[PDB]
Amino acid sequence: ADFDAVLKCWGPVEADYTTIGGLVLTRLFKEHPETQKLFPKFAGIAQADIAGNAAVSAHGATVLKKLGELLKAKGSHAAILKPLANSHATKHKIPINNFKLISEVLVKVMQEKAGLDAGGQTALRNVMGIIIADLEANYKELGFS
Ligand code: HEM
Numbered sequence: 001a002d003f004d005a006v007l008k009c010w011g012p013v014e015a016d017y018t019t020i021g022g023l024v025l026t027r028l029f030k031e032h033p034e035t036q037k038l039f040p041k042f043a044g045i046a047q048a049d050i051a052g053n054a055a056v057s058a059h060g061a062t063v064l065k066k067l068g069e070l071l072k073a074k075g076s077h078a079a080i081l082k083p084l085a086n087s088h089a090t091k092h093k094i095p096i097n098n099f100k101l102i103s104e105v106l107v108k109v110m111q112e113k114a115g116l117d118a119g120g121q122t123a124l125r126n127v128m129g130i131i132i133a134d135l136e137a138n139y140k141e142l143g144f145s
Helices: 002-007 017-031 033-038 054-072 077-090 097-113 118-141
Strands: none
Touching (some): 002 118, 017 033, 017 097, 033 097, 054 118
């Protein structure tokens, strides 16, 4: 049910993953400035210059596309999410807490831009909690605790 609740508001997100993606990463770097150093391609860009940066928006689209693919998948999740844990722990070196930060940014962006109401916000927090718990478990399998 919670996946369906999010999907009832996903139209404006998938309509323009680049614009919405840029809003998400811009807001992440604004509100949680310590996250910006986790993207070496973007670390050091003055905050005022992020909203208009096309590469930031393209990278925001990547996360939103993958979340959409996690919402619409008819086969194994687990198979979509294990590779994500692997790359984020071993290649990108992203501490787990950062996933909670980006999830809360997305909740707020969807409230503002995608009509996600109180119940939908709870549903999205539940979905993101499922995802984050799986990432955390897979991180631990790799030795990250
Ligand atoms: C559930 C949340 C997230 C999803 C679905 C997601 C998804 C992705 C995907 C699909 C890629 C490209 C393929 C790969 O390398 O695995 C990627 C790359 C990356 N992600 Fe994430 N990500 C998430 C959260 C984060 C967070 C919280 C950060 C840092 C705050 C982060 C930082 C990165 C970086 C640095 C890359 C590499 C970008 C590049 O190659 O320039 N991701 N992510």
